[PDB]
């Protein structure tokens, strides 16, 4: 029920769902979550991939979203982040809502966390967890990957424009010294790297 308010008023949260601004806002909200991990001093690389299947991945080398079950809540902290709107201040719509809104408006979302020597994943359909967050391997790395398929029920157009993403990612690179920002478009075999060390 945590995501019901977003399913009911997608436009209020993400912006215009027709003109493509709301659609690209979905990527920017996930990137903003990775930028916060960089501002916290924990992340210095963010990779945005537009996939052949038209889904988008955002991967960071941050701490990784915490995976521990808060008995209070009964589920992994990550599931709380993905299925409950935060309480802080917040293309039209709201700026800084983060991944909960993106989850709600995605037909599918796949979460991978690299944390505490372990690889954890969870899948959502339209914001509903399909199974509890689970361990699937070991890793020496840390960070978070969010891959999402924006809902064809919510957005009249679902094809990401590599130029709109590239232009905003260059602004963010300039605004965030020391963060290596990579954009990959597998549809056209493009890679851009923006690295402003300052
Ligand atoms: C979408 O998640 C975002 C994160 O996005 C990314 N890409 O990392 C990032 O923006 C930021 O991530 C934080 C924000 C706060 C803490 C944080 O305070 C940590 N400190 C702890 O000792 C800790 C350890 C376990 C634990 O369950 C929690 C609370 C869990 C939270 C805040 C989800 C905190 C920690 O390890 O990781 C943190 C992380 C990874 O805030 C989220 C979780 C909403």
Residue numbers in the entry: 28 to 117, 126 to 233
Paper passage:
Gyrase is a heterotetramer of GyrA and GyrB subunits (A2B2), while topo IV is a heterotetramer of ParC and ParE subunits (C2E2). We have developed compounds with a promising activity against Acinetobacter baumannii and Pseudomonas aeruginosa, which are both on the WHO priority list of antibiotic-resistant bacteria. Cocrystal structures of 1 in complex with Escherichia coli GyrB24 and (S)-27 in complex with A. baumannii GyrB23 and P. aeruginosa GyrB24 revealed their binding to the ATP-binding pocket of the GyrB subunit.
Whereas fluoroquinolones, which target both gyrase and topo IV, are widely used in the clinic, inhibitors interfering with ATP binding to GyrB/ParE subunits have not found significant clinical application, despite intensive research efforts during the last 70 years since the discovery of novobiocin, the first ATP-competitive GyrB inhibitor.
